Structure formats: C-alpha cells, structure tokens
Amino acid sequence: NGQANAMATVQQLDPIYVDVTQPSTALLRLRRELASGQLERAGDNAAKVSLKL
Amino acid sequence: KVNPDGSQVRLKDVADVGLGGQDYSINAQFNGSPASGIAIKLATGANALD
C-alpha cells in the first residue's frame, strides 16, 4: 500500500501541454519596452502562434 | 549551461563579445591623426638601398 514505484501508467493525448522556458532578462526588457520605449500591444490576436517539431 | 527542461544560459548574458585588438599596449599617431605603422629592420649582411 502506497509504494513509490508505479505498476503501470495511463495518459491522455488530447490535448497536450507544452511548456517552454524564457530568460528573465528578455521579460524585463519587454516590460520596459512595452510601456515607455517603443509602445506596442497587439491584443487577443497575440494569444498564441504555432510551434516547430 | 542547459537543463533537461529546456532552460539554458549562453555566452551573451554573461559576457559581451566583440571584435577588438589582440594587444592594446602600442598605438601611434602621425601629426595628431591616429595611425598605425610597421618598422623595418635590416637583415645582417644585407644592403640598404636595394
């Protein structure tokens, strides 16, 4: 009862999460550009674009 | 340095790469304007004007 190692595994493939990484320097640079530098905001059309395998 | 989740650090957020001089010890100018030069010595037993 309650052993660590599993005996089998089930998973769902529809949909699929994908988690990417981003350095914090680009995030703070985008924050300092988004409000005082080159002012820009796309909107809900900037929800998501595609990925590459 | 990378990690298996995909996170990475490269040679641009820890250093600034640039094309520069191999040595900064010697530099010269000519009448105030900055200019490099090459100084020729003569081999032993060689003639000068030729």
Side-chain angles (χ1 to χ4, degrees), chain A residues 5-46:
Chain A
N5 43 357
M7 50 181 51
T9 181
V10 196
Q11 49 195 356
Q12 281 196 194
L13 314 170
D14 203 1
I16 285 175
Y17 287 136
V18 49
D19 48 353
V20 309
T21 176
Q22 185 196 7
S24 75
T25 69
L27 187 52
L28 56 93
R29 183 246 299 164
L30 180 60
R31 281 186 309 186
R32 87 166 74 257
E33 187 262 0
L34 206 82
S36 67
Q38 203 275 341
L39 265 295
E40 48 177 19
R41 185 58 255 169
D44 61 352
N45 53 3

PDB file of all heavy atoms in Angstrom, chain A residues 5-46:
ATOM      1  N   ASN A   5       7.202   3.295  -6.479  1.00  0.00           N
ATOM      2  CA  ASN A   5       7.203   2.912  -7.883  1.00  0.00           C
ATOM      3  C   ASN A   5       5.820   2.452  -8.320  1.00  0.00           C
ATOM      4  O   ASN A   5       5.130   1.731  -7.596  1.00  0.00           O
ATOM      5  CB  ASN A   5       8.227   1.806  -8.119  1.00  0.00           C
ATOM      6  CG  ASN A   5       8.186   0.744  -7.046  1.00  0.00           C
ATOM      7  OD1 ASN A   5       7.435   0.851  -6.079  1.00  0.00           O
ATOM      8  ND2 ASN A   5       8.994  -0.294  -7.211  1.00  0.00           N
ATOM      9  N   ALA A   6       5.415   2.878  -9.510  1.00  0.00           N
ATOM     10  CA  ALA A   6       4.116   2.508 -10.035  1.00  0.00           C
ATOM     11  C   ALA A   6       4.176   1.141 -10.698  1.00  0.00           C
ATOM     12  O   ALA A   6       5.245   0.557 -10.886  1.00  0.00           O
ATOM     13  CB  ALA A   6       3.629   3.549 -11.036  1.00  0.00           C
ATOM     14  N   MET A   7       3.001   0.629 -11.056  1.00  0.00           N
ATOM     15  CA  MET A   7       2.921  -0.626 -11.784  1.00  0.00           C
ATOM     16  C   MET A   7       2.569  -0.436 -13.250  1.00  0.00           C
ATOM     17  O   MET A   7       2.978  -1.253 -14.080  1.00  0.00           O
ATOM     18  CB  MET A   7       1.901  -1.559 -11.127  1.00  0.00           C
ATOM     19  CG  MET A   7       0.560  -0.926 -10.854  1.00  0.00           C
ATOM     20  SD  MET A   7      -0.582  -2.061 -10.056  1.00  0.00           S
ATOM     21  CE  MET A   7       0.431  -2.646  -8.709  1.00  0.00           C
ATOM     22  N   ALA A   8       1.829   0.616 -13.585  1.00  0.00           N
ATOM     23  CA  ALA A   8       1.520   0.956 -14.968  1.00  0.00           C
ATOM     24  C   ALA A   8       1.173   2.434 -15.007  1.00  0.00           C
ATOM     25  O   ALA A   8       1.099   3.105 -13.973  1.00  0.00           O
ATOM     26  CB  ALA A   8       0.375   0.111 -15.528  1.00  0.00           C
ATOM     27  N   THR A   9       0.935   2.935 -16.215  1.00  0.00           N
ATOM     28  CA  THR A   9       0.637   4.347 -16.379  1.00  0.00           C
ATOM     29  C   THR A   9      -0.366   4.560 -17.504  1.00  0.00           C
ATOM     30  O   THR A   9      -0.322   3.884 -18.537  1.00  0.00           O
ATOM     31  CB  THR A   9       1.925   5.150 -16.607  1.00  0.00           C
ATOM     32  OG1 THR A   9       1.609   6.537 -16.746  1.00  0.00           O
ATOM     33  CG2 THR A   9       2.713   4.659 -17.819  1.00  0.00           C
ATOM     34  N   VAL A  10      -1.322   5.454 -17.255  1.00  0.00           N
ATOM     35  CA  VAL A  10      -2.330   5.850 -18.225  1.00  0.00           C
ATOM     36  C   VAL A  10      -2.155   7.341 -18.473  1.00  0.00           C
ATOM     37  O   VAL A  10      -1.794   8.097 -17.566  1.00  0.00           O
ATOM     38  CB  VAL A  10      -3.761   5.532 -17.734  1.00  0.00           C
ATOM     39  CG1 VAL A  10      -4.755   5.581 -18.881  1.00  0.00           C
ATOM     40  CG2 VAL A  10      -3.815   4.181 -17.053  1.00  0.00           C
ATOM     41  N   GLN A  11      -2.379   7.764 -19.712  1.00  0.00           N
ATOM     42  CA  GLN A  11      -2.235   9.174 -20.029  1.00  0.00           C
ATOM     43  C   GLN A  11      -3.176   9.555 -21.155  1.00  0.00           C
ATOM     44  O   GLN A  11      -3.600   8.716 -21.956  1.00  0.00           O
ATOM     45  CB  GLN A  11      -0.790   9.515 -20.391  1.00  0.00           C
ATOM     46  CG  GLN A  11      -0.169   8.589 -21.402  1.00  0.00           C
ATOM     47  CD  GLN A  11       1.336   8.733 -21.444  1.00  0.00           C
ATOM     48  OE1 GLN A  11       1.909   9.582 -20.762  1.00  0.00           O
ATOM     49  NE2 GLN A  11       1.988   7.890 -22.228  1.00  0.00           N
ATOM     50  N   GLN A  12      -3.500  10.842 -21.197  1.00  0.00           N
ATOM     51  CA  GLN A  12      -4.332  11.404 -22.249  1.00  0.00           C
ATOM     52  C   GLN A  12      -3.475  12.215 -23.206  1.00  0.00           C
ATOM     53  O   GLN A  12      -2.559  12.927 -22.785  1.00  0.00           O
ATOM     54  CB  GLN A  12      -5.437  12.283 -21.671  1.00  0.00           C
ATOM     55  CG  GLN A  12      -6.610  11.494 -21.137  1.00  0.00           C
ATOM     56  CD  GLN A  12      -7.841  12.343 -20.939  1.00  0.00           C
ATOM     57  OE1 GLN A  12      -8.796  11.928 -20.284  1.00  0.00           O
ATOM     58  NE2 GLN A  12      -7.827  13.545 -21.500  1.00  0.00           N
ATOM     59  N   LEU A  13      -3.777  12.102 -24.495  1.00  0.00           N
ATOM     60  CA  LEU A  13      -3.019  12.784 -25.532  1.00  0.00           C
ATOM     61  C   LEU A  13      -3.816  13.867 -26.241  1.00  0.00           C
ATOM     62  O   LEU A  13      -3.319  14.445 -27.213  1.00  0.00           O
ATOM     63  CB  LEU A  13      -2.502  11.773 -26.556  1.00  0.00           C
ATOM     64  CG  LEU A  13      -1.875  10.516 -25.959  1.00  0.00           C
ATOM     65  CD1 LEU A  13      -1.631   9.478 -27.036  1.00  0.00           C
ATOM     66  CD2 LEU A  13      -0.587  10.867 -25.247  1.00  0.00           C
ATOM     67  N   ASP A  14      -5.030  14.151 -25.798  1.00  0.00           N
ATOM     68  CA  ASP A  14      -5.805  15.218 -26.410  1.00  0.00           C
ATOM     69  C   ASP A  14      -6.487  16.041 -25.326  1.00  0.00           C
ATOM     70  O   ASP A  14      -7.414  15.550 -24.673  1.00  0.00           O
ATOM     71  CB  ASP A  14      -6.839  14.651 -27.381  1.00  0.00           C
ATOM     72  CG  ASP A  14      -7.273  15.662 -28.418  1.00  0.00           C
ATOM     73  OD1 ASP A  14      -6.758  16.798 -28.391  1.00  0.00           O
ATOM     74  OD2 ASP A  14      -8.129  15.323 -29.260  1.00  0.00           O
ATOM     75  N   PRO A  15      -6.064  17.290 -25.098  1.00  0.00           N
ATOM     76  CA  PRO A  15      -4.969  18.000 -25.761  1.00  0.00           C
ATOM     77  C   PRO A  15      -3.611  17.671 -25.152  1.00  0.00           C
ATOM     78  O   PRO A  15      -3.491  16.657 -24.472  1.00  0.00           O
ATOM     79  CB  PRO A  15      -5.327  19.462 -25.529  1.00  0.00           C
ATOM     80  CG  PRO A  15      -5.996  19.453 -24.219  1.00  0.00           C
ATOM     81  CD  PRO A  15      -6.755  18.158 -24.131  1.00  0.00           C
ATOM     82  N   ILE A  16      -2.600  18.499 -25.408  1.00  0.00           N
ATOM     83  CA  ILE A  16      -1.252  18.279 -24.895  1.00  0.00           C
ATOM     84  C   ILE A  16      -0.686  19.603 -24.405  1.00  0.00           C
ATOM     85  O   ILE A  16      -0.733  20.613 -25.117  1.00  0.00           O
ATOM     86  CB  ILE A  16      -0.329  17.638 -25.957  1.00  0.00           C
ATOM     87  CG1 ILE A  16      -0.661  16.159 -26.135  1.00  0.00           C
ATOM     88  CG2 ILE A  16       1.131  17.780 -25.605  1.00  0.00           C
ATOM     89  CD1 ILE A  16       0.111  15.507 -27.214  1.00  0.00           C
ATOM     90  N   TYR A  17      -0.178  19.606 -23.174  1.00  0.00           N
ATOM     91  CA  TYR A  17       0.520  20.769 -22.664  1.00  0.00           C
ATOM     92  C   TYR A  17       1.915  20.824 -23.262  1.00  0.00           C
ATOM     93  O   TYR A  17       2.564  19.799 -23.456  1.00  0.00           O
ATOM     94  CB  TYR A  17       0.632  20.706 -21.145  1.00  0.00           C
ATOM     95  CG  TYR A  17      -0.649  20.959 -20.398  1.00  0.00           C
ATOM     96  CD1 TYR A  17      -1.008  20.164 -19.321  1.00  0.00           C
ATOM     97  CD2 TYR A  17      -1.493  21.995 -20.760  1.00  0.00           C
ATOM     98  CE1 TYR A  17      -2.173  20.394 -18.625  1.00  0.00           C
ATOM     99  CE2 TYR A  17      -2.658  22.236 -20.070  1.00  0.00           C
ATOM    100  CZ  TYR A  17      -2.994  21.431 -19.005  1.00  0.00           C
ATOM    101  OH  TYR A  17      -4.157  21.668 -18.314  1.00  0.00           O
ATOM    102  N   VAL A  18       2.382  22.030 -23.554  1.00  0.00           N
ATOM    103  CA  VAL A  18       3.777  22.250 -23.906  1.00  0.00           C
ATOM    104  C   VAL A  18       4.280  23.434 -23.094  1.00  0.00           C
ATOM    105  O   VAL A  18       3.673  24.509 -23.100  1.00  0.00           O
ATOM    106  CB  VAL A  18       3.985  22.442 -25.423  1.00  0.00           C
ATOM    107  CG1 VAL A  18       3.037  23.454 -26.015  1.00  0.00           C
ATOM    108  CG2 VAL A  18       5.403  22.867 -25.714  1.00  0.00           C
ATOM    109  N   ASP A  19       5.339  23.217 -22.330  1.00  0.00           N
ATOM    110  CA  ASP A  19       5.893  24.277 -21.504  1.00  0.00           C
ATOM    111  C   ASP A  19       7.285  24.625 -22.000  1.00  0.00           C
ATOM    112  O   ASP A  19       8.144  23.750 -22.150  1.00  0.00           O
ATOM    113  CB  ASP A  19       5.882  23.904 -20.021  1.00  0.00           C
ATOM    114  CG  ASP A  19       6.431  22.526 -19.751  1.00  0.00           C
ATOM    115  OD1 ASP A  19       6.710  21.782 -20.709  1.00  0.00           O
ATOM    116  OD2 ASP A  19       6.572  22.179 -18.560  1.00  0.00           O
ATOM    117  N   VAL A  20       7.476  25.902 -22.298  1.00  0.00           N
ATOM    118  CA  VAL A  20       8.729  26.416 -22.805  1.00  0.00           C
ATOM    119  C   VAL A  20       9.350  27.292 -21.733  1.00  0.00           C
ATOM    120  O   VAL A  20       8.733  27.609 -20.717  1.00  0.00           O
ATOM    121  CB  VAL A  20       8.538  27.193 -24.115  1.00  0.00           C
ATOM    122  CG1 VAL A  20       7.758  26.353 -25.090  1.00  0.00           C
ATOM    123  CG2 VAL A  20       7.818  28.489 -23.841  1.00  0.00           C
ATOM    124  N   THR A  21      10.588  27.690 -21.970  1.00  0.00           N
ATOM    125  CA  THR A  21      11.331  28.474 -20.999  1.00  0.00           C
ATOM    126  C   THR A  21      11.697  29.826 -21.589  1.00  0.00           C
ATOM    127  O   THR A  21      11.780  29.982 -22.809  1.00  0.00           O
ATOM    128  CB  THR A  21      12.587  27.740 -20.556  1.00  0.00           C
ATOM    129  OG1 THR A  21      13.336  28.572 -19.665  1.00  0.00           O
ATOM    130  CG2 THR A  21      13.439  27.397 -21.754  1.00  0.00           C
ATOM    131  N   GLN A  22      11.885  30.810 -20.721  1.00  0.00           N
ATOM    132  CA  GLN A  22      12.286  32.118 -21.200  1.00  0.00           C
ATOM    133  C   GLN A  22      13.135  32.809 -20.145  1.00  0.00           C
ATOM    134  O   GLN A  22      12.749  32.839 -18.974  1.00  0.00           O
ATOM    135  CB  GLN A  22      11.068  32.987 -21.527  1.00  0.00           C
ATOM    136  CG  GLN A  22      11.429  34.315 -22.151  1.00  0.00           C
ATOM    137  CD  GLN A  22      10.288  35.301 -22.108  1.00  0.00           C
ATOM    138  OE1 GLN A  22       9.253  35.040 -21.502  1.00  0.00           O
ATOM    139  NE2 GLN A  22      10.471  36.443 -22.756  1.00  0.00           N
ATOM    140  N   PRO A  23      14.294  33.348 -20.521  1.00  0.00           N
ATOM    141  CA  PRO A  23      15.118  34.072 -19.549  1.00  0.00           C
ATOM    142  C   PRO A  23      14.431  35.341 -19.071  1.00  0.00           C
ATOM    143  O   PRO A  23      13.667  35.973 -19.803  1.00  0.00           O
ATOM    144  CB  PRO A  23      16.396  34.388 -20.332  1.00  0.00           C
ATOM    145  CG  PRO A  23      15.999  34.290 -21.761  1.00  0.00           C
ATOM    146  CD  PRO A  23      14.970  33.217 -21.819  1.00  0.00           C
ATOM    147  N   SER A  24      14.706  35.698 -17.816  1.00  0.00           N
ATOM    148  CA  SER A  24      14.019  36.820 -17.189  1.00  0.00           C
ATOM    149  C   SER A  24      14.475  38.154 -17.757  1.00  0.00           C
ATOM    150  O   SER A  24      13.747  39.150 -17.648  1.00  0.00           O
ATOM    151  CB  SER A  24      14.245  36.791 -15.681  1.00  0.00           C
ATOM    152  OG  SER A  24      15.560  37.211 -15.367  1.00  0.00           O
ATOM    153  N   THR A  25      15.668  38.190 -18.358  1.00  0.00           N
ATOM    154  CA  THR A  25      16.198  39.425 -18.922  1.00  0.00           C
ATOM    155  C   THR A  25      15.357  39.901 -20.096  1.00  0.00           C
ATOM    156  O   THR A  25      15.040  41.092 -20.201  1.00  0.00           O
ATOM    157  CB  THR A  25      17.641  39.213 -19.364  1.00  0.00           C
ATOM    158  OG1 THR A  25      17.664  38.327 -20.489  1.00  0.00           O
ATOM    159  CG2 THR A  25      18.443  38.588 -18.241  1.00  0.00           C
ATOM    160  N   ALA A  26      14.964  38.973 -20.973  1.00  0.00           N
ATOM    161  CA  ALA A  26      14.092  39.320 -22.089  1.00  0.00           C
ATOM    162  C   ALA A  26      12.713  39.733 -21.599  1.00  0.00           C
ATOM    163  O   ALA A  26      12.073  40.605 -22.196  1.00  0.00           O
ATOM    164  CB  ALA A  26      13.985  38.143 -23.057  1.00  0.00           C
ATOM    165  N   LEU A  27      12.265  39.155 -20.485  1.00  0.00           N
ATOM    166  CA  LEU A  27      10.958  39.501 -19.938  1.00  0.00           C
ATOM    167  C   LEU A  27      10.949  40.919 -19.381  1.00  0.00           C
ATOM    168  O   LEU A  27      10.027  41.699 -19.652  1.00  0.00           O
ATOM    169  CB  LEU A  27      10.567  38.493 -18.861  1.00  0.00           C
ATOM    170  CG  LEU A  27       9.152  38.608 -18.302  1.00  0.00           C
ATOM    171  CD1 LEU A  27       8.137  38.638 -19.428  1.00  0.00           C
ATOM    172  CD2 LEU A  27       8.875  37.449 -17.369  1.00  0.00           C
ATOM    173  N   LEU A  28      11.987  41.286 -18.626  1.00  0.00           N
ATOM    174  CA  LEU A  28      12.040  42.646 -18.098  1.00  0.00           C
ATOM    175  C   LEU A  28      12.348  43.663 -19.190  1.00  0.00           C
ATOM    176  O   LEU A  28      11.893  44.810 -19.107  1.00  0.00           O
ATOM    177  CB  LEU A  28      13.056  42.743 -16.956  1.00  0.00           C
ATOM    178  CG  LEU A  28      14.518  42.330 -17.138  1.00  0.00           C
ATOM    179  CD1 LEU A  28      15.416  43.493 -17.539  1.00  0.00           C
ATOM    180  CD2 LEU A  28      15.031  41.682 -15.865  1.00  0.00           C
ATOM    181  N   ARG A  29      13.084  43.261 -20.231  1.00  0.00           N
ATOM    182  CA  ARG A  29      13.315  44.161 -21.354  1.00  0.00           C
ATOM    183  C   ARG A  29      12.031  44.402 -22.138  1.00  0.00           C
ATOM    184  O   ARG A  29      11.759  45.531 -22.562  1.00  0.00           O
ATOM    185  CB  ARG A  29      14.404  43.590 -22.258  1.00  0.00           C
ATOM    186  CG  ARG A  29      14.783  44.487 -23.417  1.00  0.00           C
ATOM    187  CD  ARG A  29      14.400  43.849 -24.735  1.00  0.00           C
ATOM    188  NE  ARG A  29      15.079  42.576 -24.935  1.00  0.00           N
ATOM    189  CZ  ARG A  29      14.719  41.673 -25.841  1.00  0.00           C
ATOM    190  NH1 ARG A  29      13.680  41.904 -26.630  1.00  0.00           N
ATOM    191  NH2 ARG A  29      15.395  40.540 -25.958  1.00  0.00           N
ATOM    192  N   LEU A  30      11.215  43.358 -22.310  1.00  0.00           N
ATOM    193  CA  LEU A  30       9.918  43.523 -22.953  1.00  0.00           C
ATOM    194  C   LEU A  30       8.979  44.356 -22.092  1.00  0.00           C
ATOM    195  O   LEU A  30       8.159  45.118 -22.615  1.00  0.00           O
ATOM    196  CB  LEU A  30       9.311  42.152 -23.245  1.00  0.00           C
ATOM    197  CG  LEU A  30       7.942  42.104 -23.920  1.00  0.00           C
ATOM    198  CD1 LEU A  30       7.998  42.802 -25.264  1.00  0.00           C
ATOM    199  CD2 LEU A  30       7.474  40.671 -24.075  1.00  0.00           C
ATOM    200  N   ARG A  31       9.101  44.243 -20.768  1.00  0.00           N
ATOM    201  CA  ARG A  31       8.283  45.068 -19.883  1.00  0.00           C
ATOM    202  C   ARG A  31       8.699  46.534 -19.943  1.00  0.00           C
ATOM    203  O   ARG A  31       7.847  47.428 -19.889  1.00  0.00           O
ATOM    204  CB  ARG A  31       8.368  44.546 -18.451  1.00  0.00           C
ATOM    205  CG  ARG A  31       7.499  43.332 -18.185  1.00  0.00           C
ATOM    206  CD  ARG A  31       7.513  42.962 -16.714  1.00  0.00           C
ATOM    207  NE  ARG A  31       8.874  42.855 -16.199  1.00  0.00           N
ATOM    208  CZ  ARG A  31       9.180  42.427 -14.980  1.00  0.00           C
ATOM    209  NH1 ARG A  31       8.219  42.062 -14.143  1.00  0.00           N
ATOM    210  NH2 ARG A  31      10.447  42.363 -14.597  1.00  0.00           N
ATOM    211  N   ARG A  32      10.001  46.802 -20.059  1.00  0.00           N
ATOM    212  CA  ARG A  32      10.446  48.191 -20.109  1.00  0.00           C
ATOM    213  C   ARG A  32      10.262  48.794 -21.496  1.00  0.00           C
ATOM    214  O   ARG A  32      10.228  50.020 -21.635  1.00  0.00           O
ATOM    215  CB  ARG A  32      11.901  48.303 -19.660  1.00  0.00           C
ATOM    216  CG  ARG A  32      12.940  48.111 -20.753  1.00  0.00           C
ATOM    217  CD  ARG A  32      14.312  48.566 -20.292  1.00  0.00           C
ATOM    218  NE  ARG A  32      14.903  47.624 -19.347  1.00  0.00           N
ATOM    219  CZ  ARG A  32      14.956  47.817 -18.034  1.00  0.00           C
ATOM    220  NH1 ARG A  32      14.454  48.923 -17.501  1.00  0.00           N
ATOM    221  NH2 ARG A  32      15.511  46.905 -17.250  1.00  0.00           N
ATOM    222  N   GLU A  33      10.146  47.958 -22.526  1.00  0.00           N
ATOM    223  CA  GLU A  33       9.839  48.458 -23.857  1.00  0.00           C
ATOM    224  C   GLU A  33       8.343  48.629 -24.068  1.00  0.00           C
ATOM    225  O   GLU A  33       7.931  49.521 -24.817  1.00  0.00           O
ATOM    226  CB  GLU A  33      10.422  47.504 -24.903  1.00  0.00           C
ATOM    227  CG  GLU A  33      10.334  47.972 -26.345  1.00  0.00           C
ATOM    228  CD  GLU A  33       9.159  47.360 -27.081  1.00  0.00           C
ATOM    229  OE1 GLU A  33       8.418  46.569 -26.461  1.00  0.00           O
ATOM    230  OE2 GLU A  33       8.977  47.663 -28.277  1.00  0.00           O
ATOM    231  N   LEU A  34       7.528  47.821 -23.388  1.00  0.00           N
ATOM    232  CA  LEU A  34       6.098  47.774 -23.659  1.00  0.00           C
ATOM    233  C   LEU A  34       5.370  49.005 -23.141  1.00  0.00           C
ATOM    234  O   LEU A  34       4.248  49.284 -23.576  1.00  0.00           O
ATOM    235  CB  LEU A  34       5.499  46.517 -23.032  1.00  0.00           C
ATOM    236  CG  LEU A  34       4.230  45.946 -23.661  1.00  0.00           C
ATOM    237  CD1 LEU A  34       4.585  45.090 -24.860  1.00  0.00           C
ATOM    238  CD2 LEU A  34       3.436  45.149 -22.640  1.00  0.00           C
ATOM    239  N   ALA A  35       5.977  49.748 -22.215  1.00  0.00           N
ATOM    240  CA  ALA A  35       5.288  50.851 -21.565  1.00  0.00           C
ATOM    241  C   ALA A  35       5.910  52.215 -21.814  1.00  0.00           C
ATOM    242  O   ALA A  35       5.181  53.211 -21.808  1.00  0.00           O
ATOM    243  CB  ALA A  35       5.220  50.613 -20.050  1.00  0.00           C
ATOM    244  N   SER A  36       7.221  52.295 -22.033  1.00  0.00           N
ATOM    245  CA  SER A  36       7.873  53.594 -22.141  1.00  0.00           C
ATOM    246  C   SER A  36       8.726  53.700 -23.398  1.00  0.00           C
ATOM    247  O   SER A  36       8.962  54.802 -23.902  1.00  0.00           O
ATOM    248  CB  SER A  36       8.734  53.862 -20.906  1.00  0.00           C
ATOM    249  OG  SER A  36       9.825  52.963 -20.845  1.00  0.00           O
ATOM    250  N   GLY A  37       9.190  52.568 -23.914  1.00  0.00           N
ATOM    251  CA  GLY A  37      10.024  52.572 -25.099  1.00  0.00           C
ATOM    252  C   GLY A  37       9.195  52.645 -26.361  1.00  0.00           C
ATOM    253  O   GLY A  37       8.366  53.546 -26.510  1.00  0.00           O
ATOM    254  N   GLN A  38       9.424  51.726 -27.292  1.00  0.00           N
ATOM    255  CA  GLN A  38       8.538  51.600 -28.443  1.00  0.00           C
ATOM    256  C   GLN A  38       7.220  51.020 -27.952  1.00  0.00           C
ATOM    257  O   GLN A  38       7.122  49.827 -27.657  1.00  0.00           O
ATOM    258  CB  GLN A  38       9.167  50.726 -29.521  1.00  0.00           C
ATOM    259  CG  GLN A  38       8.618  50.986 -30.914  1.00  0.00           C
ATOM    260  CD  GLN A  38       7.354  50.200 -31.203  1.00  0.00           C
ATOM    261  OE1 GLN A  38       7.059  49.211 -30.534  1.00  0.00           O
ATOM    262  NE2 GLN A  38       6.601  50.636 -32.207  1.00  0.00           N
ATOM    263  N   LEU A  39       6.206  51.877 -27.846  1.00  0.00           N
ATOM    264  CA  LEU A  39       4.908  51.455 -27.337  1.00  0.00           C
ATOM    265  C   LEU A  39       4.216  50.531 -28.330  1.00  0.00           C
ATOM    266  O   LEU A  39       4.062  50.861 -29.509  1.00  0.00           O
ATOM    267  CB  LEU A  39       4.031  52.677 -27.055  1.00  0.00           C
ATOM    268  CG  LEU A  39       3.984  53.269 -25.640  1.00  0.00           C
ATOM    269  CD1 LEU A  39       3.357  52.285 -24.668  1.00  0.00           C
ATOM    270  CD2 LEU A  39       5.354  53.709 -25.146  1.00  0.00           C
ATOM    271  N   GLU A  40       3.796  49.367 -27.844  1.00  0.00           N
ATOM    272  CA  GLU A  40       3.187  48.367 -28.705  1.00  0.00           C
ATOM    273  C   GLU A  40       2.344  47.426 -27.861  1.00  0.00           C
ATOM    274  O   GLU A  40       2.711  47.091 -26.730  1.00  0.00           O
ATOM    275  CB  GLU A  40       4.246  47.575 -29.477  1.00  0.00           C
ATOM    276  CG  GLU A  40       5.398  47.064 -28.635  1.00  0.00           C
ATOM    277  CD  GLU A  40       6.370  46.237 -29.447  1.00  0.00           C
ATOM    278  OE1 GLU A  40       6.354  46.355 -30.689  1.00  0.00           O
ATOM    279  OE2 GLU A  40       7.142  45.460 -28.848  1.00  0.00           O
ATOM    280  N   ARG A  41       1.209  47.015 -28.424  1.00  0.00           N
ATOM    281  CA  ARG A  41       0.364  45.990 -27.817  1.00  0.00           C
ATOM    282  C   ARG A  41      -0.521  45.419 -28.915  1.00  0.00           C
ATOM    283  O   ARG A  41      -1.301  46.159 -29.522  1.00  0.00           O
ATOM    284  CB  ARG A  41      -0.477  46.557 -26.679  1.00  0.00           C
ATOM    285  CG  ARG A  41      -1.275  45.506 -25.930  1.00  0.00           C
ATOM    286  CD  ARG A  41      -0.363  44.437 -25.350  1.00  0.00           C
ATOM    287  NE  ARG A  41      -0.426  43.189 -26.109  1.00  0.00           N
ATOM    288  CZ  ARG A  41       0.415  42.175 -25.945  1.00  0.00           C
ATOM    289  NH1 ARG A  41       1.388  42.256 -25.048  1.00  0.00           N
ATOM    290  NH2 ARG A  41       0.285  41.079 -26.677  1.00  0.00           N
ATOM    291  N   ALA A  42      -0.405  44.115 -29.166  1.00  0.00           N
ATOM    292  CA  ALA A  42      -1.167  43.508 -30.251  1.00  0.00           C
ATOM    293  C   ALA A  42      -2.603  43.224 -29.828  1.00  0.00           C
ATOM    294  O   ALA A  42      -3.552  43.602 -30.525  1.00  0.00           O
ATOM    295  CB  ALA A  42      -0.479  42.229 -30.723  1.00  0.00           C
ATOM    296  N   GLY A  43      -2.784  42.556 -28.694  1.00  0.00           N
ATOM    297  CA  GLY A  43      -4.114  42.242 -28.206  1.00  0.00           C
ATOM    298  C   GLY A  43      -4.405  40.757 -28.132  1.00  0.00           C
ATOM    299  O   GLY A  43      -3.494  39.952 -27.912  1.00  0.00           O
ATOM    300  N   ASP A  44      -5.673  40.381 -28.325  1.00  0.00           N
ATOM    301  CA  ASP A  44      -6.054  38.974 -28.212  1.00  0.00           C
ATOM    302  C   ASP A  44      -5.604  38.158 -29.417  1.00  0.00           C
ATOM    303  O   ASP A  44      -5.585  36.924 -29.359  1.00  0.00           O
ATOM    304  CB  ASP A  44      -7.567  38.852 -27.989  1.00  0.00           C
ATOM    305  CG  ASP A  44      -8.399  39.423 -29.134  1.00  0.00           C
ATOM    306  OD1 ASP A  44      -7.849  40.064 -30.058  1.00  0.00           O
ATOM    307  OD2 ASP A  44      -9.632  39.230 -29.102  1.00  0.00           O
ATOM    308  N   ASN A  45      -5.241  38.825 -30.513  1.00  0.00           N
ATOM    309  CA  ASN A  45      -4.614  38.140 -31.634  1.00  0.00           C
ATOM    310  C   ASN A  45      -3.209  37.650 -31.303  1.00  0.00           C
ATOM    311  O   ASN A  45      -2.682  36.785 -32.010  1.00  0.00           O
ATOM    312  CB  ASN A  45      -4.593  39.061 -32.855  1.00  0.00           C
ATOM    313  CG  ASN A  45      -3.978  40.422 -32.556  1.00  0.00           C
ATOM    314  OD1 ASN A  45      -3.511  40.686 -31.447  1.00  0.00           O
ATOM    315  ND2 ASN A  45      -3.980  41.296 -33.553  1.00  0.00           N
ATOM    316  N   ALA A  46      -2.598  38.181 -30.241  1.00  0.00           N
ATOM    317  CA  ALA A  46      -1.336  37.684 -29.713  1.00  0.00           C
ATOM    318  C   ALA A  46      -1.538  36.655 -28.613  1.00  0.00           C
ATOM    319  O   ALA A  46      -0.753  36.614 -27.655  1.00  0.00           O
ATOM    320  CB  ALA A  46      -0.483  38.841 -29.197  1.00  0.00           C
TER     321      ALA A  46
END
